[PDB]
Amino acid sequence: MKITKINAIPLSYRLPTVTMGVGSTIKRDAIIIRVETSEGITGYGEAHPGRSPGAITSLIHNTIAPMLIGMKATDCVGAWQRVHRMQLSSHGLGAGAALAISGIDMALWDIRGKAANMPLYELLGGSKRRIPAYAGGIALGYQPKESLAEEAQEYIARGYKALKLRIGDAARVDIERVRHVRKVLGDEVDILTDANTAYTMADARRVLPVLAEIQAGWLEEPFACNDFASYREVAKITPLVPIAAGENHYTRFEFGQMLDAGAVQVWQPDLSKCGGITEGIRIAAMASAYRIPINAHSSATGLNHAATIHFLAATENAGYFEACVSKFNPFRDMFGTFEIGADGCVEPPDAPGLGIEVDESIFEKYPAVDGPGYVV
Amino acid sequence: MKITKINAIPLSYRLPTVTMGVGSTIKRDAIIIRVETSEGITGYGEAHPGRSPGAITSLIHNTIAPMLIGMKATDCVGAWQRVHRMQLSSHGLGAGAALAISGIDMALWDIRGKAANMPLYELLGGSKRRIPAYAGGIALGYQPKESLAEEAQEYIARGYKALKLRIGDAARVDIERVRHVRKVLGDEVDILTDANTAYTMADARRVLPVLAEIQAGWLEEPFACNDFASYREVAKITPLVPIAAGENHYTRFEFGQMLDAGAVQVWQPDLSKCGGITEGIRIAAMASAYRIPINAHSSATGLNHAATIHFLAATENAGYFEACVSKFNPFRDMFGTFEIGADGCVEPPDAPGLGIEVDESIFEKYPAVD
Amino acid sequence: MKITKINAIPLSYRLPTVTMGVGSTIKRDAIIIRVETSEGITGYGEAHPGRSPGAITSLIHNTIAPMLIGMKATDCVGAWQRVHRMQLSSHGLGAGAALAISGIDMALWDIRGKAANMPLYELLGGSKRRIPAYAGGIALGYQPKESLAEEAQEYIARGYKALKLRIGDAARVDIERVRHVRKVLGDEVDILTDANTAYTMADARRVLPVLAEIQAGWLEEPFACNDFASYREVAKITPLVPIAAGENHYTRFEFGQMLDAGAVQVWQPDLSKCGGITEGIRIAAMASAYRIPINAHSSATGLNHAATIHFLAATENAGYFEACVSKFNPFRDMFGTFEIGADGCVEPPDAPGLGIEVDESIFEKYPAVDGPGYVV
Amino acid sequence: MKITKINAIPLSYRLPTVTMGVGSTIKRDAIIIRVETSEGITGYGEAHPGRSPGAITSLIHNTIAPMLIGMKATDCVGAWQRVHRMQLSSHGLGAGAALAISGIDMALWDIRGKAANMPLYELLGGSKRRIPAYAGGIALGYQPKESLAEEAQEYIARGYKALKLRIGDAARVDIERVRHVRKVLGDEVDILTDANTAYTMADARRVLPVLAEIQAGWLEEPFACNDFASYREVAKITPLVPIAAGENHYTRFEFGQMLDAGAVQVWQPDLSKCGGITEGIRIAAMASAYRIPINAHSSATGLNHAATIHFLAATENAGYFEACVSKFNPFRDMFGTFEIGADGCVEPPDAPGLGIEVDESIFEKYPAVD
Ligand SMILES: [Mg+2]
Ligand SMILES: [Mg+2]
Ligand SMILES: [Mg+2]
Ligand SMILES: [Mg+2]
């Protein structure tokens, strides 16, 4: 079974807005990858658009796809190694190639599930199990504290035992917001926080004590992805709340650097970013030996959501699934929906591969838009 | 003076080969950045193609240019900041965005020198001085040791006091090559080595002692850019030959990470890769306090070469300039040749900005190939 | 364009007093540097008097000026390197030479701005932007806590969102003072503290908890500039308030030593002390990679105030400008004033060089006085 | 007994040259400090000029003397403290103030020995003993290797068992010099080396192994005084030859910083630079617990030489005395010659205080030059 065609299909959706630390969201983009085989089996993956989806599309169509055509379709380790030496190790696009191979790998695993007649959790050695979820996605953004509390109440009513508050616009206001949410929900809900790379160190030494006071589960991404000196300096503030990162981190080599720095104790690789399922396993296994929980970051599509839940089912040190709960996200319920149970958990689809049926006539409903996706 | 237009112009050339540690070269690519201003002054830069020139071009035109139109063209610090917060810090393309800003930033400093009526060395605070150079680029590749020695002798005859040997294919064959060159050039030539990310650790503990024996200037890029664990292990082998890295390292935050690892003691940023001249200064200033020499890596075009020499003339802790000496390279001589003197040195051009005049009719001679 | 003449002009002013950790201020001194070029352009800088202004004057006129006459006037990097090898590296005056070259460098950059027809922020690559300021200078010294509160209220009325309280006479009294100021101003004002090298370690372990309680922005200079073991030992007290230093620190080499000690996380180089603008950039860039904010220390004259604001406009990791607010400081408003806005910010002058016009007939109004400047 | 007058007397001498790592010597300068008391006893010291003798003189007369007039002349600890809090700790001149207090402090100990009717070694708690010496000062500079060897042989014939070779101009030429001296003197002479802050790291990893090969006593000052990062890197090269530093290091707080860096294992304070005899004791006492030898650096005048020998006789962990052996140096023999014996050693004078009589009519013979 050889690889015949690899195609990157860029999709986008314009909405009539939720403010985070990265700015204000005006447009949602997604890149869906199709890999065709010699024996007729077709696999589907999702690559992250990287705030410039035309570039990842081009990178696949011009460089990465030709180096993988003709390869055996189950050899995703060998497929990953070609991208590693031609792009990741030297003179390449670095992080952009990781995004590109992430979707391809994901599609190759979908082929591998279909060829073995196994769902992905079974292919990886796990079982169909209940995986805890929190209300995340592009929701719970910057708004008055009482309105933010009401949105949080809506999610517990929907069965969530955990939620992720978006912080990082000003220390004072999100101290005020974070305190009010604990006040109205009680101390039974795992309140998680995400600063989305927007805090300084001065902000952190003000916010971290109140996070320990409200007993938050983690502080996610307080600084820039490459801000190494700030990441080691926050660890010194409080041991009662761990630092979380991984969304903007690529390959096991970047995660290995944050392993022996020892500051970030909660890892969140996005399978549409980090290098795919193959690299996801490698990252999680390193974390496993050091007892670090994997709370995977989720991308836009229900394809990535399928791959993530399958991955967490077979990953021993899996923590949370990040569930998108925003009302204006069509990529989530694009084909065959995940659904949260009353136990606060989620389940992988019981069908070969990723267990998602892809009708290609939905791509026409969400065409490519060349504009920017963010407002700061 | 505001920014009006930013365009990325892809150029490529097919050669009818020199093998290094990354592979075999069949086609050279380059991306030239044109920045137009509201007062008629036009800047030029080089962005590294990153093995996919169509992707960086797409990234510039769709994303990085729209966020920079309307900015004051002298504000390169602010221009770098917008790219830092929109692309480099969060959900962007990471390393690819750094290549894209590198050329734009270089073109911004070109505008700024012309508007100030100063050459770039003068703009950066330096003076026109002789900068030592080594014979490098896509030259001195894998070949028999006596043929490699004949190529080496030709560069000393042209004036060079230093050269860079390509190692990394097989441990035995490049120990054999490296020892032979020392005997035929004597111990007066600074012999530098580049492994082009092709060594393992098992190779390194076999090769490093002979590099000490021949008193090599540095071992450049023995491992992949993100291979942190190997880089810290090779520093334990010998203190007599330092490790060099920088080509595949982007922003001062990645260089900052290898500062406190302490393993790499020779920093080699590429101004067409690391973030431009702006980030080049910041990387070099950090190295300056730690007495780490900046031996900048050179890209394809004579634009990048001009910018690098201008940079090193004003940079306090500057080491060598990497001189491209392969003669199947039209990008170097594309618009008015650097020239190596009998002192083995090189001079910055004494004209406003980068000191290079760009005729756009030459772009048609080298069309873009996928 | 060559250098023709370098002249150090010592100035002083006697006042009919504000008490700090360095003692009681009775006389203010300043050294203004004039550099003349071959092409008629004249630049102006400020060197710190170093508590013995006759010595810096002598050092310039006898040693440093002759080694720089004939040099190209835009080659300030090369000018700095000559002073580095002849004075800073070996057998020299060390810190005194740094003060001397600071003013000369500053004057050379003023020439460079005028020759390029650019203001200094534009020459360094920045833009005209709003830079936050705090009430500093020789103000808010030792006095009864209620009178100290009234002086603080006057500055917020003048638009300051931040201020620097002078501490360090006794632990008990400035704990009492610091608590009262937070009480009357609310927790919206960034209260900064400066001990002016006067604390012991025993004082620090008493004062630092109350500073964390009142959430102070930093503790500036608790010990002697060379007191390395005390600087690393205070870092162990509280992570909620960082230690600040740099006023009495010279060259990037002394700042590099405090970088890898890792204790001081807020850097304050004085451009009239550290080695000038050239060295200022080098110090700030090292801090930039490690995400350390530069909150530059200000000297006496409006020349240094111009150079500082220009420097902070083009410095990416710039924090605060230290604004002198003392009523008896004529050096500040000596020629063409800075003015604080309602946003709590300050702006660089929009004119070539430092943007300050120097009338030399004001030097006669402030002649040199040979006496001491401090009382302890 | 109070302090009445403190005066700084600048002296200089033009020579019609010996090249070291800092440059070429054309004129030697010295500053002599006279401290008068209310009971008629007068002390003398030497302050280092710091390449600008007019500045230190100005600093003493305008600032440091006014803060010390009226103090009890035996209270040198309190005298050092006033200078510490007024000049060294905060907004002062830093390193220059340390040079200024060094001579005053030395003159204070001169008064104190005379008032106690004890020589300084006895005042410090030691006894008159033979102290090993090496041939140094502005001697054994850059010259052909055989001419350098002839100068070396002359010092062994005079009695010396140790000498200090000036290296640092070029790595090749001083490897050549250092090897030649070992062969012509044998392995019985302690060969010490001084680079005078002129090496890079690339030079060091080429030179250090040959210094190990020739079994050199130490490598003195390879880098600038504040070049912290290089000093920690050279300790990694070879454990067989230690690094020496101290000439350009002031107060026990800078020596304390190089204690916990662990890189420099031979400390060389200058009593005319580091803070005087008072600070000299404190620097040496810290070194004593860590078993670091104190091989003090010598200044210009025979006053400083007298103070140094007195100091080392009473100092537990004293190593070598630096003997100035250049014969174009009148400051050494200015008022009654030290003398080297056949044991290669040197003795402190057996007279109250520093044991030197100062005739002020000799000051006219060496007037001050700008
Ligand atoms: Mg996130
Ligand atoms: Mg290379
Ligand atoms: Mg202060
Ligand atoms: Mg010496």
Q: Annotate D62-79 with b (16+ C-beta within 10 A) or e (fewer).
A: bbbbebbeeeebbbbeeb
- The nearest alpha carbon in chain C to A206 belongs to C240
Closest by CA position to D106, among listed D262, D290, D310, D287: D310
Residues 6+ apart with CB under 8 A from C365: none
Residue with tokens 């060598």: B320
D36 marked as binding residue: no
- Rounded distance between C-alpha atoms, residue A8 and residue A1, angstroms: 21
Chains that touch A (3 or more CB pairs under 8 A): B, C
Residue with tokens 């005048």: D301
Closest by CA position to B316, among listed B164, B131, B192: B131
Q: From its phi and psi, is residue A196 left (phi > 0), alpha (psi between -120 and 50) or beta?
A: left
Measured in angstroms, the resolution is 2.7
Q: Name the residue facing B314 among C77, C260, C316 (closest C-beta).
A: C77
Domain boundary among A96, A117, A138: A117
Output the 3-class SS for chain D: CEEEEEEEEEEEEECCCCECCCCECCEEEEEEEEEEECCCCEEEEEECCCCCHHHHHHHHHHHHCCCCCCCECCCHHHHHHHHHHHHHCCCCCCHHHHHHHHHHHHHHHHHHHHHHCCEHHHHCCCCCCCEEEEEECCCCCCCCHHHHHHHHHHHHHHCCCEEEEECCCCHHHHHHHHHHHHHHHCCCCEEEEECCCCCCHHHHHHHHHHHHHCCCCCEECCCCCCCHHHHHHHCCCCCCCCEEECCCCCHHHHHHHHHCCCCEEEECCECCCCCCHHHHHHHHHHHHHCCCCECCECCCCHHHHHHHHHHHHHCCCECCEEEECCCCCCCCCCCCCCCCCCCCEECCCCCCECCCCCCHHHCCCCCCCC
User: How far apart are the two ends of chain B, measured CA to CA in Å?
Assistant: 36
**Torsions phi, psi for B46 (to 5 deg):** -120, 125
The CATH number linked to D299 is: 3.20.20.120
Q: Amino acid letter at A356?
A: I
Distance of CA C258 to the CA centre of its chain: 18
Helix or strand run (H / E) with residue A24: strand A23-25
- Rounded distance between C-alpha atoms, residue A295 and residue D94, angstroms: 54
CA of C105 to the centre of ligand 4 (A): 30
Closest by CA position to B277, among listed B229, B309, B233: B309
Closest by CA position to B342, among listed B111, B133, B186: B133
- Rounded distance between C-alpha atoms, residue C8 and residue C100, angstroms: 9
Q: Beta-carbon neighbour count of residue C130 at 10 Å?
A: 12
- Rounded distance between C-alpha atoms, residue C281 and residue B315, angstroms: 12
- The nearest alpha carbon in chain B to D226 belongs to B289
Cβ atoms of residues B135 and B332 within 8 Å = no
Radius of gyration of chain B (CA): 20
> How many H-runs (helices) and E-runs (strands) does chain C carry?
11, 14
B270 marked as binding residue: no
Q: What is the DSSP letter of A296?
A: P
Cβ atoms of residues C199 and C174 within 8 Å = no
Closest by CA position to B264, among listed B297, B287, B282: B287
Residues 6+ apart with CB under 8 A from C138: C18, C20, C25, C28, C324, C326, C329
Cβ atoms of residues B292 and B265 within 8 Å = yes
Domain boundary among B53, B84, B117: B117
Handedness of CA D152, D155, D161, D162 (dihedral sign): negative
Strand ranges across the sheet with A374-375:
A19-20, A23-25, A374-375
For residue C27, the cross-strand partners are C14
**Torsions phi, psi for B174 (to 5 deg):** -100, -15
The answer to whether the Cβ–Cβ distance between B51 and A372 falls below 8 Å is no
Same domain, C252 and C112: no
Residues 6+ apart with CB under 8 A from B113: B119, B120, B122, B123, B352, B353, B354
Same domain, C47 and C153: no
The answer to whether the Cβ–Cβ distance between A93 and B54 falls below 8 Å is no
Check contact A-B (3+ Cβ pairs < 8 Å): yes
What is the count of structural domains for chain C? 2
Q: Name the residue facing B197 among A57, A89, A251 (closest C-beta).
A: A89
Is C63 at the interface with chain D, CB within 8 A?
A: yes
The CATH number linked to B86 is: 3.30.390.10
Q: Name the residue facing B75 among C78, C127, C252 (closest C-beta).
A: C127
Cβ atoms of residues D26 and D14 within 8 Å = yes
Tokens of A17: 């807005």
Taking the CA atoms of residue D175, residue D176, residue D177 and residue D180 in that order, the dihedral angle to the nearest 10 degrees is 120
Same domain, C111 and C193: no
The answer to whether the Cβ–Cβ distance between A96 and B99 falls below 8 Å is no
* Coil, helix or strand at residue A68: coil
Tokens of B352: 């406003």
CA of B300 to the centre of ligand 2 (A): 12
Residue with tokens 């534009």: C122
Cβ atoms of residues A95 and A250 within 8 Å = yes
For residue B317, the cross-strand partners are none
CA angle B56, B59, B65 (to 5 degrees): 120
Is C51 at the interface with chain D, CB within 8 A?
A: yes
Same domain, A155 and A14: no
Closest by CA position to C271, among listed C311, C220, C243, C244: C311
Method: X-ray
Handedness of CA A112, A118, A121, A123 (dihedral sign): negative
The answer to whether the Cβ–Cβ distance between C91 and D51 falls below 8 Å is yes
Measured between beta carbons, which residues in chain A are less than 8 angstroms from residue C217?
Answer: 202
Q: Beta-carbon neighbour count of residue C229 at 10 Å?
A: 13
* Coil, helix or strand at residue C346: strand
Q: Say which ligand is closest to the CA of D22.
A: 4
Helix or strand run (H / E) with residue A220: strand A219-220
Same domain, D196 and D254: yes
Tokens of D77: 């600890």
The answer to whether the Cβ–Cβ distance between C74 and B118 falls below 8 Å is yes
The answer to whether the Cβ–Cβ distance between C55 and D66 falls below 8 Å is no
Which chain residues have CB less than 5 Å from ligand 4, an ion? D 194
Most distant CA pair in chain A, distance = 60
Check contact D-C (3+ Cβ pairs < 8 Å): yes
> By residue range, what is the domain housing residue D226?
118-370
Most distant CA pair in chain D, distance = 60
CA angle A294, A295, A299 (to 5 degrees): 125
CA of D137 to the centre of ligand 4 (A): 7
Which chain residues have CB less than 5 Å from ligand 1, an ion? A 194, 247
Taking the CA atoms of residue C208, residue C212, residue C216 and residue C217 in that order, the dihedral angle to the nearest 10 degrees is 90
For residue C101, the cross-strand partners are none
**What CA–CA distances, in Å, run from C322 to B294, B333, C226, C295, C354?**
34, 51, 23, 7, 17
CA of B48 to the centre of ligand 2 (A): 14
The answer to whether the Cβ–Cβ distance between C241 and A205 falls below 8 Å is yes
- Rounded distance between C-alpha atoms, residue C245 and residue C196, angstroms: 10
Q: Amino acid letter at B290?
A: Y
Helices C276-289, C95-116: inter-axial angle, 10-degree rounding: 100
Closest by CA position to B272, among listed B36, B117, B100: B100
Closest CA of chain B from A351, distance in Å: 32
Task: Report the half-sphere exposure of A346 (CA within 13 A, side-chain side).
Answer: 30
Distance of CA D82 to the CA centre of its chain: 24
The answer to whether the Cβ–Cβ distance between D201 and B242 falls below 8 Å is yes
The answer to whether the Cβ–Cβ distance between B291 and D227 falls below 8 Å is yes
- Rounded distance between C-alpha atoms, residue B173 and residue A36, angstroms: 42
- The nearest alpha carbon in chain D to C224 belongs to D89
A227 marked as binding residue: no
* Coil, helix or strand at residue C302: helix
Residues making up chain C, counted from first to last = 376
Measured between beta carbons, which residues in chain B are less than 8 angstroms from residue A229?
Answer: 256
Taking the CA atoms of residue A163, residue A167, residue A172 and residue A177 in that order, the dihedral angle to the nearest 10 degrees is -30
Same domain, A14 and A161: no
- Rounded distance between C-alpha atoms, residue B205 and residue B223, angstroms: 13
Q: What is the DSSP letter of B278?
A: H
Is B212 at the interface with chain C, CB within 8 A?
A: no
Q: What is the DSSP letter of A196?
A: T
Same domain, D209 and D298: yes
Q: What is the DSSP letter of B67?
A: T
- Give the residue numbers of the binding site of C for Mg(2+): 194, 220, 247
Residues 6+ apart with CB under 8 A from A81: none
Percentage helix, strand, coil for chain C under 3-state DSSP, each rounded to 5? 35, 20, 45
CA of A78 to the centre of ligand 1 (A): 30
User: How far apart are the two ends of chain A, measured CA to CA in Å?
Assistant: 48
Closest by CA position to D322, among listed D172, D221, D188, D198: D221
Tokens of D70: 């009226």
Cβ atoms of residues A251 and A274 within 8 Å = yes
Spell out where chain B has E strands. Answer: 3-14, 27-37, 42-47, 131-136, 162-166, 190-194, 219-220, 243-245, 264-267, 321-324, 345-346
Same domain, D228 and D355: yes
Q: Amino acid letter at A81?
A: Q
- Rounded distance between C-alpha atoms, residue B73 and residue B37, angstroms: 7
Q: Amino acid letter at C89?
A: S
CA of D194 to the centre of ligand 4 (A): 6
Measured between beta carbons, which residues in chain D are less than 8 angstroms from residue B265?
Answer: 201, 233
Q: Amino acid letter at B315?
A: T
Chain discontinuities in chain C, listed by preceding residue (C to N exceeding 2.5 Å): 16, 337
**Torsions phi, psi for D352 (to 5 deg):** -50, 140
- Rounded distance between C-alpha atoms, residue A155 and residue A144, angstroms: 17
The answer to whether the Cβ–Cβ distance between A205 and C239 falls below 8 Å is yes
Same domain, A73 and A162: no
Cβ atoms of residues B56 and B8 within 8 Å = yes
CA of B195 to the centre of ligand 2 (A): 8
Same domain, B182 and B46: no
The answer to whether the Cβ–Cβ distance between A90 and B63 falls below 8 Å is no
Same domain, D147 and D286: yes
Q: Name the residue facing D229 among B215, B240, B290 (closest C-beta).
A: B290
- Rounded distance between C-alpha atoms, residue B61 and residue B9, angstroms: 10
**What CA–CA distances, in Å, run from B34 to B110, B279, C132, C254, D184?**
10, 20, 35, 41, 67
Q: Name the residue facing C240 among A200, A209, A223 (closest C-beta).
A: A209
Outline where C72-144 has alpha helix (H).
Answer: 76-83, 95-116, 120-123
Distance of CA A230 to the CA centre of its chain: 23
**What CA–CA distances, in Å, run from B128 to B122, B309, B351?**
8, 10, 11
Please identify among residues 224-253 of chain A the ones whose CB lies closer than 8 Å to any CB of chain B: 224-229, 247-248, 250-251, 253
**What CA–CA distances, in Å, run from B280 to B80, B105, B255, B340?**
12, 10, 11, 24
Helix or strand run (H / E) with residue B110: helix B95-116
Handedness of CA C247, C250, C255, C261 (dihedral sign): negative
Long-range CB pairs of D280-288, under 8 A, 24+ apart, other chains included: D280/D311, D281/D124, D281/D311, D281/D315, D282/D252, D283/D252, D283/D255, D284/D311, D284/D315, D284/D316, D284/D317, D284/D318, D286/D252, D286/D255, D286/D256, D286/D259, D287/D255, D287/D259, D287/D317, D288/D316, D288/D317
Cβ atoms of residues C105 and C275 within 8 Å = yes
Is B113 at the interface with chain C, CB within 8 A?
A: no
* Coil, helix or strand at residue B14: strand
Distance of CA C77 to the CA centre of its chain: 21
Tokens of A78: 């060998």
CA of D89 to the centre of ligand 3 (A): 13
Closest by CA position to D225, among listed B291, C52, C278: B291
Tokens of A28: 């949602």
- Rounded distance between C-alpha atoms, residue A358 and residue D29, angstroms: 89
Closest by CA position to C278, among listed C47, C101, C46: C101
CA angle B100, B106, B109 (to 5 degrees): 140
Closest CA of chain A from C290, distance in Å: 5
Q: What is the DSSP letter of B297?
A: B
Same domain, D159 and D210: yes
Cβ atoms of residues C77 and C62 within 8 Å = no
